[PDB]
Design a protein around this ligand. Structure first.
Ligand SMILES: Cc1cc2nc3c(=O)[nH]c(=O)nc-3n(C[C@H](O)[C@H](O)[C@H](O)COP(=O)(O)O)c2cc1C
Length: 394
């Protein structure tokens, strides 16, 4: 069964199906799979699912030329905090990861690892169980009143990380980037969006710092640019993306509600453009649209109208991935792709449609998706989503 109230439309006649080089990869269509954390990683070890993970990603690589960004992946153990979320720091993990990149590559597609550091969105009790800190920008301010109790009821109060501990995360970023390139990944995406650790330093709500890492637009952005500079001078600018979520409010970010939130993101896009004109242009920049400011709200909701991502394009001149609510709105995508460096990110509806790239070229209906198997240790809601040929045949 498909989304019953979805009147689809063909996009095969749009720039969404005209090839484009991103970094080193010759994309053949500009539908990009964003990072979607599926919570099928195995505990202990944060090991990618040795039952299902290669089938999952392979399935979704089926359309040749698909830029795929992998799920949020922990650069180290201090970085995560979720039992079932893949890491990429251990030989255990890297062995399975290389199996995944090989399955993607066999399908003539590409794969980029999203380097994910949780910050305050981690479970303080899961981090206290493994003798790790609970890191944010500040120690006064908490993500919400429940995290605050979890942390306080596990003697793991929130920790403002020092200038050293930041250096260590930068280190861990570069290594996790390097692992990812050697193990086979076509590039990495520095997760600096959705309120996780980097976003928490960007957003002036979560960042109460008094040092060179807070108080000002430049300071707040210092960390995110710092990880970008390390990972770039390590593996190379053409292998390095960056994800921003300017208007989002997930994990307790200001979004549009902040007046100067747009100057904050303009500043970082300005500093990525300054580096670009100095020889070191990133492979792409990945924007969350304000269409989706909380991915766990159904579509249409939590959508901030009073703000647009267009300001990016006047600053950053390289490719721009845009993700959010684009599945159910081909008329929006048909316009947005007229710009010749725009790529569209398809999130939730790539979960349900492994052949989502066909259904977009051919205007075919989209599989309805199951919210309850998003985060579930099961193969159902993971790889048992039919292609169009298979769904009719049901
Ligand atoms: C189940 C789920 C897991 C997600 N995991 C991540 C993630 O790990 N990292 C990230 O940057 N975004 C993550 N996202 C957000 C998506 O990348 C995307 O921005 C969001 O789903 C909106 O796109 P859409 O309207 O096409 O679904 C996730 C979204 C969902 C629904």
């Amino acid at each position: 069964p498909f989304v019953k109230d979805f009147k689809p439309q063909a996009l095969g006649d749009t720039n969404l199906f005209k090839p484009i080089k991103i970094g080193n990869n010759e994309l053949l269509h500009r539908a990009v799979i964003p990072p979607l954390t599926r919570m099928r990683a195995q505990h202990p070890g944060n090991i990618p699912n040795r039952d299902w993970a290669v089938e999952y990603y392979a399935q979704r690589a089926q359309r040749p030329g698909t830029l795929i960004i992998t799920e949020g992946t922990f650069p180290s153990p201090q970085s995560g905090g979720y039992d079932n979320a893949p890491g990429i720091w251990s030989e255990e993990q890297i062995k399975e990861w290389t199996k995944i990149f090989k399955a993607i590559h066999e399908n003539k597609s590409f794969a980029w690892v999203q380097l994910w550091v949780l910050g305050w969105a981690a479970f303080p009790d899961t981090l206290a169980r493994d003798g790790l800190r609970y890191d944010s920008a500040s120690d006064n301010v908490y993500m919400n009143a429940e995290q605050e109790e979890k942390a306080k009821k596990a003697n793991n109060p929130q920790h403002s990380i020092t200038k050293d501990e930041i250096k260590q995360y930068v280190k861990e970023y570069v290594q996790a980037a390097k692992n990812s390139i050697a193990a086979g990944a076509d590039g990495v995406e520095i997760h600096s969006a959705n309120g996780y650790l980097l976003n928490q330093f960007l957003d002036p709500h979560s960042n109460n710092r008094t040092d060179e890492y807070g108080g000002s637009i430049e300071n707040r952005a210092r960390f995110t640019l710092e990880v970008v500079d390390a990972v770039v001078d390590a593996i190379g600018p053409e292998k390095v993306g960056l994800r921003l979520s300017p208007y989002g409010v997930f994990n307790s970010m200001s979004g549009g509600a902040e007046t100067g939130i747009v100057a904050q993101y303009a500043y970082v896009l300005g500093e990525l453009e300054r580096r670009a004109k100095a020889g070191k242009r990133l492979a792409f920049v990945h924007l969350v649209e304000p269409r989706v400011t909380n991915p766990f709200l159904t579509e249409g909701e939590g959508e901030y109208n009073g703000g647009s991502n267009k300001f990016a394009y006047s600053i950053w001149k390289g490719p721009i991935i845009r993700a959010g609510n684009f599945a159910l709105h081909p008329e929006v995508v048909r316009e947005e792709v007229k710009d010749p460096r725009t790529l569209i990110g398809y999130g939730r509806f790539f979960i349900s449609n492994p052949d989502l790239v066909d259904r977009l070229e051919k205007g075919l209906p989209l599989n309805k998706y199951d919210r309850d198997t998003f985060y579930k240790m099961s193969a159902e809601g993971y790889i048992d989503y039919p292609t169009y040929e298979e769904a009719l045949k049901l």
